[PDB]
Amino acid sequence: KSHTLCNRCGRRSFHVQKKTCSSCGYP
Amino acid sequence: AMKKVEDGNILVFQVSMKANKYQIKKAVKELYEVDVLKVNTLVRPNGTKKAYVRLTADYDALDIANR
Amino acid sequence: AREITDIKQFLELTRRADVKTATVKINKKLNKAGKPFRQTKFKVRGSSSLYTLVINDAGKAKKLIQSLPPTLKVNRL
Amino acid sequence: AQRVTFRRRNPYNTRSNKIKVVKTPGGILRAQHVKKLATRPKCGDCGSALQGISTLRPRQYATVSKTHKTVSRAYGGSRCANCVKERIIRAFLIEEQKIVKKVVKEQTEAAK
Amino acid sequence: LSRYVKWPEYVRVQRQKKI
Amino acid sequence: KVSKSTKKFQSKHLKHTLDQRRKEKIQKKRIQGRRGNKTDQEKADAAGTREQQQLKKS
Amino acid sequence: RLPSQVVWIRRLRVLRRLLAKYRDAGKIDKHLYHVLYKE
RNA sequence: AUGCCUGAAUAGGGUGAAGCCAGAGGAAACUCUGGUGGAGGCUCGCGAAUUUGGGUAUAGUAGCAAAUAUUCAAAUGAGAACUUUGAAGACUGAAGUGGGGAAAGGUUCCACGUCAACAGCAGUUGGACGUGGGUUAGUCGAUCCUAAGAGAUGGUUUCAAAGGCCUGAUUCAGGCCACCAUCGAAAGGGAAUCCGGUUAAGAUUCCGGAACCUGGAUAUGGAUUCUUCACGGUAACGUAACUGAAUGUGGAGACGUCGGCGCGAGCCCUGGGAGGAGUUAUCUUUUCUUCUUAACAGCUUAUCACCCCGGAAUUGGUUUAUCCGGAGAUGGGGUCUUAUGGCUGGAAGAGGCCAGCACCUUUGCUGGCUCCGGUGCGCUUGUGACGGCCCGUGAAAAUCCACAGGAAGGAAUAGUUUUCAUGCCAGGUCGUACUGUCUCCAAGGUGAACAGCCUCUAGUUGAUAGAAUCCGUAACUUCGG
RNA sequence: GAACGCGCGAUACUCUUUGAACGCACAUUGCGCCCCUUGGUAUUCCAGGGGGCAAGCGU
Ligand SMILES: [Zn+2]
């Protein structure tokens, strides 16, 4: 469960600990 | 829902997801010309909002349903 | 709920403008002497509480029944 | 011999949620959550429990009259009787010592 | 303490240039 | 009758507690026969005071 | 059955109760009562 | 490897350290005997190791996917070892194969229809397929607050012009104050809801009854007693009220762990009686089961602590535990907190257990009883006064209250205040169905040595199938009066 | 570009929630301030609608 939904792109790539997206870089 | 209408004096409606209890009470009062005692809202799994509107004892819910 | 002991307070409560009905409840129960008796509870609710007057005397209860307003709905038991 | 459990969201045996077991008018055992006990107000000088002041939760003091949370004496409701007595005696003696010291200074500077 | 707050930076600079 | 806390401890913590106790016993037995394990007070006694050290030098 | 502490507590409590009752009744004065208390 | 914040757990048996009490020896010091008390690098089931949640830093062959035990009759169905009902046998045995939760999953919950595929045989079954139904909150959580830490502004308050308030016959002048956004806990802090009933599937949410919390505007009664912010008691303190600015403080929130003692409630045990069920070849006043009282509200109720009198060695009081007294003991008389019990309202009208009378049907009507007690090295839980040890005097903030202070205001056809009483109105958004690495509840009998064996309530019958200490003595020995 | 809905956006075969994304936060459909207006007894309360908020003593 290291990743969650990203608001900007909709993928399961939002790292919960880092608070950054590994697919689109949000934010 | 029709059982609730017949017995509990409760009209069951589907409402928008952007409406609160104040707006539902006001809308029922304006559209159907009845006095609302209470409003209880829930959010259904399919993304829609259901409201139970219990009217005051001065009004019969079945009469409004037939109307 | 609240318990009252004053009969005239009960009558004043039953004389208010916004009063729906009054309940008269009968209970058959024993006293400390063992002789059974009839106890009458007069219950009427005010604004936010239910006041109960308990009367263990049959005659006093009958007089209170007679003294109730004729326009007051009375629930027997 | 009926088993009961919590009635709220918390499933852990924390201080916040504590359970008592009561027999309801239905003839069954059921759980009930108990609130935290109130603490007696304490004196601001010695820390002893204040006498004559009701013990309530912090927000329950806002709904009771002033006689239930004060004492008619000075500092009543904040300090106890003995502390007030010591304060009075100490203040008076300090004032007397100030007067005596001022007289002594006046005398010792009066030589010149 | 730190009383320097009584003078804003521009006032302090324009008085320093005076000296 | 066994108490509730005893039941919970024996079901949860008994095994690892016993294992740790055995490990401490084994380590103590192994270190007892070795040389070079002395407490701070024992080492302080062995070194001695400044006067004792100056006497030992002399 | 009953452990040592429970029976000791009961014995000491009943002995002290009897001593206090006897002193209050006047059968024993302060000093004999004080000796019997420690004994 | 070392941390830090906030929770859960840190149990049990044995042994018996200081200190204390009473005896015996000696001039003391000191040594023995018994009890008490209940401690630890005590035991039992340079190096290794040292519970846990959340948060946060440095070939039609092998073989049947293994978790035991099934049998008889009936029903449904084209078809039954596998579906359904009844009977029999067996299993889990409160540390559950029992009832809930956090996280996670996402319709798996319920009904109807179906067996093309899936559930390694079959299936009429389903956590499958198709169509529908289902989750209701002022009171339960989130929402609010801050913790370790993170992070904008000019690295975390720093050489930042970083902001609010008050006074004034109209003159824009004057004055006060200091210090940094924000995020971070569904286990921490926190205002308030209970009982009964109800569905195919929803409940502290719906229904019936009953009650609280917060905020607001206002009216009435009473008080504010000569007209202007009330009294009583030596005192602790009591009260239906009984104004209070700047400013300065105090309390609750709010805080380590262990031990025994006292008290309350739930469970267990148990006597009588009033019902119902089982067994009864013989015996058995016999075995099982019902006899319940919620939140909330009124009256009353306290160990500790404190106050007044009094002035003590012939030293007294006193705890299971040796501490207290001219720094005022013993004794006598009072004050307080309401924790917790008792009575009552809620409330018997509810629920429970019975019996009788109605019908191819929602087919519900009536009548009784729901009472009185005891017991504790028992289990669970809360609480009070103590004692021991470790230690920053043992997280912070939101929030509520109080005290010092004396600014200001108050009277003649409604003076000022309304922490006294009654009365009116309102309470938004999101989660709630179902299951379930951390967590909650927890009966009895035998064991007479934690263990193991058997059962009550409640759940199962799942797994391809068929064939081959104990007998005789004596002294003693418990509570009161 | 994404999410949710009927090529399109509640006017859905005008333009919802977002996104450089802009009132503040954000893994919450969470929390504010300002102006106008309307309704429910209404000067106070509650709610609905519309529109917004990324001086110096130097000369
Ligand atoms: Zn004090």
DSSP string, C12-45: HHHTSSS--EEEEEEEEEE-TTS-EEEEEEEEEE
Q: Which two tokens stand for residue C22?
A: 């009054």
> Which range marks the domain in which residue C69 is found?
1-77
The reply to whether A13 sits in an annotated binding site is no
- Domain-wise residue ranges, chain D: 1-37, 38-112
Number of C-alpha atoms within 13 angstroms, CB side, residue E15? Answer: 6
Give chain A's largest Cα–Cα span: 20
The Cα–Cα gap between D66 and D63 comes to 10
C25 touches strand H (CB under 7 A): yes
Span from the CA of B5 to the centroid of ligand 1 (angstroms) = 66
Asked whether B12 and B50 are in contact (CB, 8 A), the reply is yes
Chain C 35-74 residues whose Cβ is under 7 Å from strand H = 41, 43, 45-50, 52, 54
- CA C42/CA C56 separation, integer angstroms: 11
Chains with 3 or more CB pairs under 8 A to chain F: none
Experimental method: cryo-EM
What is the phi/psi pair of residue C73, to 5°? Answer: -70, 130
Residue D6 near residue D19, CB atoms below 8 Å: yes
* C-alpha–C-alpha distance, residues F39 and C66, integer Å: 97
Using alpha carbons, select from B46, B52, B5 the residue that is nearest to residue B24.
B52
Q: Tokens for D57, please give them.
A: 């939760």
* Cα(D63) to centroid(ligand 1), Å: 26
Amino acid at F44: A
Neighbour subunits, B (≥3 Cβ pairs < 8 A): none
Q: What is the DSSP letter of D49?
A: B
Taking the C-alpha atoms of residue C54 and residue C27, their distance in angstroms, rounded to an integer, is: 10
Backbone angles phi, psi at D14, to 5 degrees: -95, 160
**What Å value separates CA F25 and C1' H61?**
58
Q: How far, in Å, is the centroid of ligand 1 from the Cα of F8?
A: 46
Distance D91 CA to H175 C1' (A): 34
**CB neighbours of residue D4 within 10 Å:** 14
Tell me the CA–C1' distance in angstroms for B45 and H80.
Answer: 40
Complete DSSP assignment for G13-36: HHHHHHHHHHHHHTSS-HHHHHHH
Where does chain D break, by residue before each gap (C–N > 2.5 Å)?
none
**Is A1 within any annotated ligand binding site?**
no
F31-F36-F40-F44 Cα dihedral, nearest 10 degrees: 150
Query: Which residue type sits at D66?
Result: K
Coil vs helix vs strand at F43: helix
HSE-up (13 A, CA, CB side) for residue B5: 13
| Cα D84 to averaged position of ligand 1 atoms, centre (Å) | 8
Burial class (CB within 10 angstroms; exposed 0-12, middle 13-18, buried 19+) of C55: buried
Count of domains in chain C? 1
Resolution in A: 3.1
- The closest alpha carbon to C54, from C15, C21, C10, belongs to C10
Q: What is the Cα–Cα distance from A24 to A11, expressed in whole angstroms?
A: 9
With b for 16 or more beta-carbon neighbours within 10 A and e for fewer, the D33-42 pattern comes to eeeeeeeebe
